[model samples]
Target: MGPFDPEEMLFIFTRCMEDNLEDGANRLPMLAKWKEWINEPVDSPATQCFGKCVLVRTGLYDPVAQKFDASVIQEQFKAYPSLGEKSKVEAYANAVKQLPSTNNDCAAVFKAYDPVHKAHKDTSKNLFHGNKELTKGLYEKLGKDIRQKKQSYFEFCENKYYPAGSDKRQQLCQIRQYTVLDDALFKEHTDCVMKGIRYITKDNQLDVEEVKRDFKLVNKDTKALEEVLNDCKSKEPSNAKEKSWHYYKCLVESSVKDDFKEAFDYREVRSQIYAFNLPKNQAYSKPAVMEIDGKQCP
Candidate 1:
């Protein structure tokens, strides 16, 4: 709650979204489109209140003052330098100060962090978009620095993955199928993990066929996905990790608009292997059956 590790912050953010958004109908659906709602300058009343609720609960917002605590980001950067430098605090605070304040605490929350959020985007770009050696170097750095805090999500997933070394890294590939449900903060980490596993090609594109298999995506979903893909075909992060992140978000936005969103839920995998289990084994490979080395381990 104090030091903002990406995984912890993301978990807190998601939990707040679920816990707070008791509003109804379109709002519930809005969270399914989390990336888009969050990117807004100022959005709906429900989303605004939703953001306000989270900001307040997370201790970043002061209800009376209706302003964010810059110290939170300060502590976050100090604890986790993955974003940039703690020195950026002045700039972020200045940015927050420049914004016109009002009664809407939610917009205040998002508006205040406007620069801070970009710092996060900049963080992903810094880590992902680079030459192979640089990216590998950057990747290792983020892993080490980030793992110190919310060690479970990063270390457990990463350690358990590369903890395999026979042909390639082990369960990282096996764990490669997680659906990045909401935050792209989570996306960058999982993308790094996937890159480590070789699922995201060096070119930074997700192995869509493989991803489809992971999500059990049907052809109907594929049509919408392709339709979305055919349009976006762009990126700001410069490499595959960021490109893959952008496209997945793009596809997800399109999916949310269509019925393809259930595909998003298919792979809401977490730390344990058993979460991979679908409703029935029909098309999904049985959870406990994975071919490791030459034999199998579930």
Candidate 2:
């Protein structure tokens, strides 16, 4: 369909209003007219007039009052669940608010636009009575577009900060090793260190040796390492085992100072770790050799 189609606009409008009914008895009839034109091309003159019909019928724009009613807009906002949903509903309201305020009878104006009404009526008849494929294809395309744009912000954040391919654990280690932990880098440093521990813990391939090597390279206190290692041993009393990656993960996750924990999502961190190291064909996979934390490394 074209950029501005009445059918397309009406479909979105119905979706936004589906759950809301300020005055069901009066609004239902207008809502039905909107549904009737759902498959018709929106750019048509009839569709534009139908747009006006909806505003007048829903009490959003009162031709007699010669102004857009604010109460109806407030009621619509209350029907939405989140700030995002409310914002979308507000956007549609703003579109209708831009229409000219006419003192003439809205119903008569709509009725006099015979060409638009006929065009819409004929299109509706041809689709439902004749070839239903046209309507079916339009809806299928609309559904597909909606599905493709449904990625969540949290997933987007993870993809931005921790991409796939380059060793996540190694990247975390490097972030800890080189970043100067001043006020400017405090958040990044803490996040990197905690994330490093998480990645290392689940990675069976990583061991204490690599941790020790990286620790020494960064001039970190060996005593701190011993304290965490001993803590891990104490937690598992059955046998005396050397420090494993899992031990390191627990240490880092638990050791984060109180100031940073409030900003961190431990559960999300773990979930991210689970989805790491995926095959290229699978979801959430990163490129093999890419930049991490402003440094180009594998």
Candidate 3:
């Protein structure tokens, strides 16, 4: 097989997204799509297994409500900085009680809550204290495209899986945490990637057998594959928006046999992949869509 073509890339991404939406009930088609894209001799990391696990767990543990009950509140309070405060603690309890219960909304809320467990103490002092601004900055740095995704997945889940009248409810659903791994995996993956012990092909293909063998070199204390894919910080792009847009464009261009130079012709494709239209409804600020006008590219 050769490197994945543009169309195959599109299919691979589409399959991945579909598999996610379906809760990973099936992914053979997605795997097949990936194979089609990578038409050359290559190896894929065992990340597929992890991806599948995420899907299954997403479906199984999908959150239903926004309220963090006394037990959850107590659990989070353990890590709270101002554990001695009463009025502040009461505010935390009341805030969560007002959140929604729909699948997507709750999922987001849950993610919001997970970090609060450790920051409960800080949150009481300033709603945006400690790492709060850092978090906000990180979110802002994602730029308009990736920032849109934060809510896109939430809305996608709600629109597809939840009831019709659900959106009108005062309360929205929320998930407790990242479905598969702890938050630290982001850092872990980047470290492994930068160490360069693992190989990345010109087009992102990774060698499974070689990766597995290299684990012995690390004293076998860590799951090299897992750490590389999950924990490594190297995957974090210095230019997230540009890279993501490139990836998004490449996927669509591949499917349509159009090179990136000709990518803008496919505005609808860009809109769908980046969820450009969804964020405004949620009051999220975003870039205006570029007009086609008399534009032409090939």
Candidate 4:
């Protein structure tokens, strides 16, 4: 029998796309082409084009065909430079490895931070838009320390105030954290937005539809995610718990709305989305069969 050739190794790439759903539909076809040309004896253009397809799909390069269409990009990857490193074909492969954890952290942080930021911004607009009564009402409800703390937190976030690196030595000088109460007060202030939204929405003056639309709350799934984060906050946590109530609290309050629904399933959707963005291979190398101890290894 003939030995396994690079040409035959391409099928594995096609199988890799099955791992995620986010870009799987588009990725699968490209992988198929990659499989077809993997074993050419010479430096065939098809193999190169396959390289570009891998590069573009993984976001290492701004591949026009991969983004808006695929047929041309399919041909594009078959060319020599398409498979070469200059095309960032390899860097994208590395990025794929880091994407899972990075993207999860990103999604979690964005889910936590953005809604709070929006609430604060909205409140600020309400306060400055000549709604003295409304502004006075919220301030009165939050009290002075709480209000100040909230404002301070906003300033910190706006100023990118967070301890960087493992040591506190790298802290930004412009930001100050005088006490835990500062942090707690900031939390309370953000909570007040949800509180306020719920309060006003009950009266039908808060424009629930507009807020939902504005925040891009199109489907029930994302809304559910917001609820899970919120529920995590109120649920009591033991010290041994891997997750913190406050962390979930912050996540929930920052991500969810007061009108958030209970029936939504964020766990499923988040998992799905996470799986969708995950990388199949650690590196974008063409596959090969190897002999280990004189035995074939696939």
Q: Which numbered prediction scores highest in TM-score against the true structure? A: 1
Against the hidden reference, what TM-scores do the models get? 0.37, 0.24, 0.19, 0.18
> Quick one: how many clashes does candidate 3 have?
35
Model 1 bad stretches (over 4 Å):
20-29, 85-89, 97-298
RMSD of 3: 21.1
Which 10-residue window of candidate 2 scores lowest in summed lDDT? 275-284
Q: State the lDDT of candidate 3 residue by residue for 56-102, as single tens digits.
A: 22231234332333343434345333332556666665654544442
Better of 1 and 4 by lDDT: 1
lDDT, residue 272, candidate 1: 27
Tell me the TM-score of model 2: 0.24
Worst 10 residues of 1 by lDDT: 271-280
Off by over 4 Å in 3: 1-70, 79-84, 105-298
Using TM-score, rank the candidates from best to worst. Answer: 1, 2, 3, 4
Which regions of candidate 4 are displaced past 4 Å? Answer: 1-153, 156-220, 233-298
lDDT of each: 0.48, 0.39, 0.32, 0.31
How high is the lDDT of residue 170 in model 1?
48
lDDT for model 3 comes to 0.32
Query: After best superposition, candidate 4 residue 154: deviation in angstroms?
Result: 2.3
Q: Report the C-alpha lDDT of model 4 over 36-91, residue by residue, as the tens digit.
A: 33222114333334333333333333333212222322232343231223334333
